């Protein structure tokens, strides 16, 4: 066995398949960073840090010796526990098609939100600087009126052009901004269509992030190093409930500071 | 023979083919639920219920025994009788191309309307909860002005996005709302074109339903379990008329409560 | 895994085999309905109802439509929990041949009694009418004197003959009546031998039932529809005990009302 004690869980194979399907569907639906950043292959449970290739000055041990520490970025393991009714798990085998997988969906959405906020807004406790802070380009402010959002999007694209970066550009919108651009139409077209016409990439729904992000998907700028991908593990169970969790180990590294523009307000 | 005593009917094979063609054409034209919901293969005349996989607490027969009833949803058989002039049936063989199949068309439209209302508006007597009642998403109100319908459609799509559901979205419009969006044009385009641009699915004409419905066609949310599909049977005949009927046995089950948005007014 | 979490139980394979052997032996010993009624093949955990082939009038959804509900009989799941000492389970591997399987025997006898009472005495909460109530033939009264039991048995056979039913006849006796006929002898022969001479079937010991039953085993009259057969499942365990259960899902249907005679007192 491995650390996910799934064999110890009182969950059937059919219920396991349904739970995995629900978690994967929700995570894919609510994730936005993986669509733009480079996702490394999982390094395995052993992997604990990613080498940045740099050196840190440290006080030599003896005279006449120059000592340097090898810099690295630690992976963080993020775990989202959730509990399931054993009645629904048992109902799956009985042919039930509407088992209550809401805790799975909530946990998957929470994990996706944490991952996206880590990639974009950063996670200081994990020594991760997000795309917003690492952006050397000036930060714009989203206007209140949705019809003026294409203006600031064009301004951000102009800033990226002045930064000399190439490759397809993708716009990431928060839930509020995405809703505003979708529900507002101009010239018989929603504002989201205007934004999609502006860039050759795609308009990404990013409910976890704040404001908006404009960045290039040429590759080699944003790296999401994965220790292990999203997995479902088992914690404990009662006679009527099972306590599972969703966990993953990752770090995010930004290499190019001028490859993104961050918008707020 | 089977319960459809077609061999006992005074209807010729050519007239039978014409009647079946008319009934199938009208049913396909006037049906909307089958285009969005999952339609099971017919289970045969024996099938009487669909297992929901759940248990119902019942009072044990003896001490020390725990008893549970197996929950299921009963299929309902819906029959629409209609009568045909024997003169038209006889005229079919004589080469007549304009036989009066209006009763067939009326019966087929009535059966399609009953099926669609059962799927969407529900049929309580058959223990069927429609999509409208089963929708956990908030219910919107269609504005009187047709030009504002894309606004509430975008609002419903935003609600579905907040519900975390994926897959292509299809908008179902009642006869009144479909007529209003078709006959009203904005920016040199009918409002129906705006709605079609909003969603990646299709705008469905649903004359049976009320208001509008926005839902995802990803699959696995709406299930139409069929005992037997639509068939034409024979009841009786006079010297000048034949009494036939259109019948089908079905039930509708909704599995996902957040996969649809219902609009009224 | 399936809903019987046997892999999660702290029970060895040898102890499992002993427990299954004990449960099967006790159930076969104490069961009487399966010897006379037709036992269907298990339909699987999904099966929740059995179609009776009939229609129920329901209030049409729209005008000009005739609607009928498909009648069915729900399966009932009967579970008999029991607890075993972990010391005995561990002793099985150590070569112990006299492990305490009394809880298994008690649970198996209780399940057999519930099944037999359901078949014969009925279980109203499960919408099951027993053989006694479904019997259209008049009900006889068993005399107090065991030597007069062959008289009423012959009377019941005469009633079955007047009902025009054929096939071998089997007499089912309650524990009290079986004990009385066995322990009482006439003409150097127990009364049970007289009863066995009366019918071409067999005298069945039916400790669950009350009074006696005379019925024909020609087939096609009494049907025991099985969802799942008797199985042993796992519930929980302590450091010294394991909580298991015996469960099965079934319904009983009587097709011929004149194929049985029920005796009381």
Swiss-Prot record, chains A, B, C:
Keyword Cell inner membrane tagged: no
Keyword set, alphabetical order: Cell membrane, Encapsulin nanocompartment, Membrane, Secreted, Virulence
Chief location category: other
A Gene Ontology cellular-component term: plasma membrane
Superkingdom, natural source: Bacteria
Pfam short name (any one): Linocin_M18
Membrane topology value: Peripheral membrane protein
Consequence of gene disruption: A single enc deletion survives less well after 3 days in 2.5 mM H2O2, pH 4.5 (mimics growth in the phagolysosome). A double dyp-enc deletion mutant cannot produce encapsulin nanocompartments, cells are highly sensitive to H2O2 at pH 4.5, mutants exhibit significant dysregulation of redox homeostasis, survive less well in C57BL/6 mouse-derived bone marrow cells and are more sensitive to pyrazinamide treatment in infected BALB/C mice.
Subcellular location: Encapsulin nanocompartment; Secreted; Cell membrane
Posttranslational mods: The initiator methionine is partially removed. When isolated from culture filtrate isoelectric focusing gives 3 bands, none of which are glycosylated.
Subunit note: Multimeric. The encapsulin nanocompartment is formed by 60 subunits. Monomers form pentamers which assemble to form shells. There are 12 pores where the pentamers meet as well as 3-fold axis channels and dimer channels; none are larger than 3-4 Angstroms in diameter. The N-terminus of the protein is inside the shell, the C-terminus is outside.
Family: Belongs to the encapsulin family. Family 1 subfamily.
More info: Stimulates a strong IFN-gamma response in memory immune C57BL/6J mouse spleen T cells, recognized by monoclonal antibody HYB 71-2.
PANTHER family: PEPTIDASE U56 FAMILY (PTHR37165), TYPE 1 ENCAPSULIN SHELL PROTEIN (PTHR37165:SF1)
Function: Shell component of a type 1 encapsulin nanocompartment in situ; its cargo protects against oxidative stress at low pH. In situ and in E.coli assembles into proteinaceous shells about 22 nm in diameter with 2.5 nm thick walls. Cargo proteins are targeted to the interior via their C-terminal extensions; empty intact shells can be isolated in E.coli in the absence of cargo protein. There are at least 4 possible cargo proteins, DyP (encoded in the same locus), FolB, BfrB and Rv1762c; DyP and Rv1762c have been identified in vivo.
Stated name of the protein: Type 1 encapsulin shell protein
Naturally occurring in which organism (per UniProt): Mycobacterium tuberculosis (strain ATCC 25618 / H37Rv)
Name of the gene: enc
